[model samples]
Target: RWKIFKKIEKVGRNVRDGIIKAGPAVAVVGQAATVVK
Candidate 1:
């Protein structure tokens, strides 16, 4: 099979909302992601 790359079909806002609703914090740090308090 050939190499394949596909992006998430969900909208950005929907994704972010889902993440936030999960009761988790998101932060970007030094090219790595970190959780916020």
Candidate 2:
């Protein structure tokens, strides 16, 4: 279980948004995630 929005597709988008806002690399764990490049 994760709190990555309503679906799995939002992780990168949300992570990118976080990076843009927070200026820090996002740390991911648990499930196997797709690499956003």
Candidate 3:
């Protein structure tokens, strides 16, 4: 049970990190699109 819990926690942490890292790139893309128009 503890092992399963740790695995879930690790996956969650990685997903959170991915979103944090991608968020800025997404915003930059949006800004670029506006500038292009």
Candidate 4:
């Protein structure tokens, strides 16, 4: 349970990092489209 949660946390971090590095358009779209899960 905790292991899966930790893995998801790591993956989410990586995706957000990539989005930030991808610049304004991508970052903005990602933000707007982001839904809490």
Q: Which candidate is the best by lDDT?
A: 4
lDDT of 2 by residue, 1-37 (tens): 5564556658767866876786653354312244543
State the lDDT of candidate 4 residue by residue for 1-37, as single tens digits: 8999999999899877976777567656666789532
Q: Write the per-residue lDDT of candidate 1 for residues 1-37, one digit (tens) a residue.
A: 2232233434556566766777344333421443433
- TM-score to true structure, per model: 0.31, 0.37, 0.45, 0.44
lDDT, model 4: 0.77
True-structure lDDT of candidate 3:
0.76
| Higher-ranked by lDDT: 2 or 3 | 3
| lDDT ranking from best candidate downward | 4, 3, 2, 1
- C-alpha root-mean-square deviation, each candidate: 6.9, 7.3, 9.0, 4.0
Worst-scoring 10-residue span by lDDT in model 1: 1-10
Each model's number of backbone clashes?
0, 0, 0, 0
Please give the distance, in angstroms, between residue 3's alpha carbon in candidate 2 and its true position after superposition.
12
The 0-to-1 C-alpha lDDT of every candidate, in the order given, reads 0.46, 0.56, 0.76, 0.77
